[PDB]
Amino acid sequence: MWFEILPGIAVMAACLFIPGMATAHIHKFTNGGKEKRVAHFSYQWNLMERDRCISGVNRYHVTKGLENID
Amino acid sequence: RGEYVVAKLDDLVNWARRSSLWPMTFGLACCAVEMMHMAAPRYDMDRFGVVFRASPRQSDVMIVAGTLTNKMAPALRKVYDQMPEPRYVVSMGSCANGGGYYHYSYSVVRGCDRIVPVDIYVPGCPPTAEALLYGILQLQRKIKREKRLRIWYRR
């Protein structure tokens, strides 16, 4: 009766599930709900600094729309 | 009381040992072949926690199964000395329990105990693959009943 194999991989299935679950939610939590920004090039990194400077609270994941400008 | 926590840590340690003891790959003679039948799908020793690991550096119980002779007795005791602590030696079969059929010959040590501190004795010629299946489980009860830390907390 091969069902007994399943409990073994069942907890394992949850075991590998936690990391991907953790990283996605931790990124979602720390970075203001939005998905964590990716900076593979200097243009992205330069873009991130501008967001941080204009945020005022020194946090890139604080985006101010048209209400910021006049 | 410190006795309670010692007993709880006592039960934790031995339960790990009795449910994970690994019989060595140490076969000698007729008594070894049927012990394979214990590892065969019929009785499936592995289901009870044991694995048949070689390399006495990574084994707990030594299944001396077969005729123990003169020319190999140094090899066994060297092997037994290599096994880490704790280590148990189950003398398996009548040959290793005193000499078996060839008790009176000239190149057999009459009993595995004369070289090694021999644990629970399972008789048979050969003991059935089930006969020492109890022999392994009966050792698991011996591992269950030890005190160790209980003596240490009362030493």
Binding site: - | R42, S91, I120, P123
Partner: protein, 176 residues
Amino acid sequence: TYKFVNMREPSMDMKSVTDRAAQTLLWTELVRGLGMTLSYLFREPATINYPFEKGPLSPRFRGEHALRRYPSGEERCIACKLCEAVCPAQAITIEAEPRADGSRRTTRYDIDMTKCIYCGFCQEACPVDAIVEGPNFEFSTETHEELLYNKEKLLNNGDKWEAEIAANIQADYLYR
């Protein structure tokens, strides 16, 4: 007669060559093994769980010895030393004496369970069915001394497994 076993020359036709080339390139006999084990994965395991259920035996099984006694209660062994005379391992050691009643019993019947090899000759030996191995394959002990049985332990085994020995011998007394 005899049969040749392996010299089968493979054909060199383009169909055969491509079949072998496909076999070597696209591993097939390796996949044949994988499909085999997977089929042999969804079977029913041949294991039996221990003591809750136990393996099957036969009435003539050979195990722990026992010294039975007559229906009256008198022991069967009249100390004829036949079992000692046939013991291949010389495990039997008995001495007799004229008992107080006048009957012919044995003072000592030490059977060394660490010497004898369960030939069963002893149960074939005595003409009164005195010594006989019981069905109890299980008597493993923690110390070497416990295995060296004397007359008293043999009688105790006779008194314990008497139900089995009477039934088993009843089944197989006709085959012998």
